[PDB]
Amino acid sequence: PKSMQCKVILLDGSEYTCDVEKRSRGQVLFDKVCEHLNLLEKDYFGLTYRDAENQKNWLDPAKEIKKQVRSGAWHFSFNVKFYPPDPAQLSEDITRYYLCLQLRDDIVSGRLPCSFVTLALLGSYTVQSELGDYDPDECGSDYISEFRFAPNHTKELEDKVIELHKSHRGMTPAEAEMHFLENAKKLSMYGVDLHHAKDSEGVEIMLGVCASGLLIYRDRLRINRFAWPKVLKISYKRNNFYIKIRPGEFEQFESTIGFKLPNHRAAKRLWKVCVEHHTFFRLL
Numbered sequence: 001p002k003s004m005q006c007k008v009i010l011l012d013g014s015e016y017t018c019d020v021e022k023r024s025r026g027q028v029l030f031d032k033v034c035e036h037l038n039l040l041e042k043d044y045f046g047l048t049y050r051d052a053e054n055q056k057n058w059l060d061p062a063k064e065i066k067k068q069v070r071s072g073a074w075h076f077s078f079n080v081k082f083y084p085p086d087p088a089q090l091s092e093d094i095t096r097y098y099l100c101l102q103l104r105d106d107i108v109s110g111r112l113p114c115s116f117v118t119l120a121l122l123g124s125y126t127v128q129s130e131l132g133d134y135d136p137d138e139c140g141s142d143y144i145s146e147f148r149f150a151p152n153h154t155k156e157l158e159d160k161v162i163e164l165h166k167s168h169r170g171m172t173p174a175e176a177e178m179h180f181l182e183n184a185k186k187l188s189m190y191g192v193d194l195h196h197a198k199d200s201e202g203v204e205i206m207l208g209v210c211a212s213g214l215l216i217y218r219d220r221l222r223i224n225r226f227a228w229p230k231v232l233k234i235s236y237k238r239n240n241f242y243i244k245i246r247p248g249e250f251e252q253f254e255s256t257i258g259f260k261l262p263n264h265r266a267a268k269r270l271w272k273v274c275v276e277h278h279t280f281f282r283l284l
């Protein structure tokens with residue numbers, strides 16, 4: 001049996017290395033990573049890899065790893081795939097912990113936009129979880145945390161994290177993580193996967209995929225929302241992605257909305273994440 005070495009970037013930034021038989025399906029590697037992480041609520045999560053364009057792709061657990069990575073390195077990341085709309089309802093604290101680590105990267109990266117006060121509040125719960133009770137000894141008027149909290153760090157943000165951290169005395173890591181999630185879950189881009197596209201007139205839009213449905217972000221005043229029940233059918237053809245929407249009270253037949261993606265691969269990727277999130281929705 002010939003085995004391929006796999007390297008997985010974990011959500012704490014560390015690297016897990018293991019071997020799988022070269023013809024292994026994704027699920028084999030994923031099971032090894034989740035056992036390493038002591039994770040039981042596995043189906044919220046998945047592995048990604050980067051292709052030659054350095055675009056992220058979900059490793060399909062049902063398909064051979066080699067038919068997905070193809071010419072690329074067997075290098076993966078462990079990530080949240082399905083963001084729980086209600087993290088309080090997860091059965092295990094360790095699940096909420098990994099979701100916190102993913103969200104911290106969502107924030108620092110700018111994928112999850114956040115007001116100054118939300119950045120500071122989330123940062124304060126992370127510090128409480130990571131270091132425990134506020135200690136003046138390792139925090140002078142000039143203090144700067146090791147923790148990355150935001151896409152752009154300022155002294156004013158560091159000071160506000162410390163002010164809020166003082167208020168959390170006696171909070172355990174599980175409690176601070178639950179508070180972090182109660183706040184993060186409310187953010188307008190929580191669990192939203194954004195895809196670049198053009199509408200049928202060639203105007204640049206963003207399509208967002210999430211547990212509740214599909215968003216068409218046209219401009220700040222114009223954001224079309226289609227809850228999953230309103231979506232009859234999804235499809236891709238060449239560089240085009242189509243959604244069929246149930247007729248409204250003033251409609252006789254369904255409507256079709258068409259979108260132009262950059263390339264055939266970007267259309268197929270969008271279709272697959274839509275199908276997957278639609279199934280997640282049907283499980284809620």
Ligand SMILES: Cc1ccc(CS(N)(=O)=O)cc1F
Binds near residue numbers: 040041042043283
């Ligand atoms: C798709 C999907 C199914 C089930 C669960 C719950 S679990 N098995 O992780 O505890 C999460 C999911 F995201």
